[PDB]
Amino acid sequence: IPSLAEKYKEYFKIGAAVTVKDLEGVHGEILVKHFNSLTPENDMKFERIHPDEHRYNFDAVDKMKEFAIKNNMKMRGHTFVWHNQTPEWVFKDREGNDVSRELLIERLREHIKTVCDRYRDIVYAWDVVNEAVEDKTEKLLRDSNWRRIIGDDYIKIAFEIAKEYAGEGKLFYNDYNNEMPYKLEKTYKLLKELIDKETPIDGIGIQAHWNIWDKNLIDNLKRAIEMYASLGLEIQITELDMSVFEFEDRRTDLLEPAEEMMELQAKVYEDVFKVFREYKGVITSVTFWGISDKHTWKDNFPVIGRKDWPLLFDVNGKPKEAFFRIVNF
Numbered sequence: 001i002p003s004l005a006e007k008y009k010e011y012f013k014i015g016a017a018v019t020v021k022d023l024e025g026v027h028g029e030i031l032v033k034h035f036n037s038l039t040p041e042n043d044m045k046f047e048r049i050h051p052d053e054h055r056y057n058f059d060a061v062d063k064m065k066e067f068a069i070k071n072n073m074k075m076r077g078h079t080f081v082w083h084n085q086t087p088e089w090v091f092k093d094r095e096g097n098d099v100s101r102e103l104l105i106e107r108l109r110e111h112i113k114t115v116c117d118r119y120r121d122i123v124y125a126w127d128v129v130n131e132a133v134e135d136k137t138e139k140l141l142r143d144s145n146w147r148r149i150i151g152d153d154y155i156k157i158a159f160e161i162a163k164e165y166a167g168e169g170k171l172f173y174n175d176y177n178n179e180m181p182y183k184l185e186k187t188y189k190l191l192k193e194l195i196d197k198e199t200p201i202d203g204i205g206i207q208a209h210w211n212i213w214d215k216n217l218i219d220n221l222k223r224a225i226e227m228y229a230s231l232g233l234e235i236q237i238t239e240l241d242m243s244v245f246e247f248e249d250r251r252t253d254l255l256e257p258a259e260e261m262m263e264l265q266a267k268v269y270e271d272v273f274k275v276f277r278e279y280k281g282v283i284t285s286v287t288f289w290g291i292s293d294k295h296t297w298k299d300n301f302p303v304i305g306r307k308d309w310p311l312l313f314d315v316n317g318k319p320k321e322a323f324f325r326i327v328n329f
Contacts, residue, residue, distance in 0.1 A: 002327050003034055011276070011277055013285040013287075014036060015288065017289045017290055018064060019041055022295065023063060023064065031073075031291065037073055041078075041289070044077060046086045046090070049115060053090075058118060076125050081154070083132075085130075090145075112158075116166050116169075120169055124169055124285075126166055128158050128201075130175070135177070140186055156197060172238075173204050175187065180220055184220075187204075203236055205238035206235060209240075211247065239287065250303050254306070257309050266322040269326055290310070292317050293315045294316075312326075
């Protein structure tokens, strides 16, 4: 039972996404021992931390910050600008009309300044913009309220605002599947354009919502690291997990992993963490999207109500085989 974060202290931070209840019981003990970074899974989404025009909700995030300071951890900020996570008041003036460009920018500035002021002492990295890149088609960017109202500059402006208030925290673009052929080159092009216009972006977040069946994962991972690194960016793995299901595999029948799933999972985790260690000079943080299989978003996404087993600790809070293979170095 080595401490994962301790074993990786000369490589990068080891993080986990958390809710307030993850700070209690067995999960809290695992956090204390194995992790030196926390990401609020939901409680820093715009609609959670800032649900009304005149009301913020800091309660959950304050408890995670208190926890992090007591237990020698730092936090990742998640997230400022993320499709479908901004409450509707932000975009509307009293008549229900779209706000002006100038006003939307100012509301974003006030949001980011408020959140950064409160937490910049504990946050070392911010997911400033999340999943702006278009996923379904060949286009670069998604349609959104921000883009409709501000225009394409909303990304750069969000980074410029976060730059004013984040102190020493680093600023990230965060996305899923940004290692895959259909998305990597587009995303590289976007980031190159932002960087050339002097957007203060420090790195890219590779969400790494992966699965044990993906043949091209290792080669995709290396190529993405190479492309993003070549722009001068730092790389953080931000929401790593390892589904036993291909994404289009919506079967609901499994009551436990089928034979070979757990060993395959351990083998893949071993391989990705060897790549992480291999490109350690540019990867600065590795965060899992959960602590143990008892509590994972993969049980309800993409399929409501079916069990998955994607993390390093099993349903009993105990370390699975994957854990032992990634501390084996």
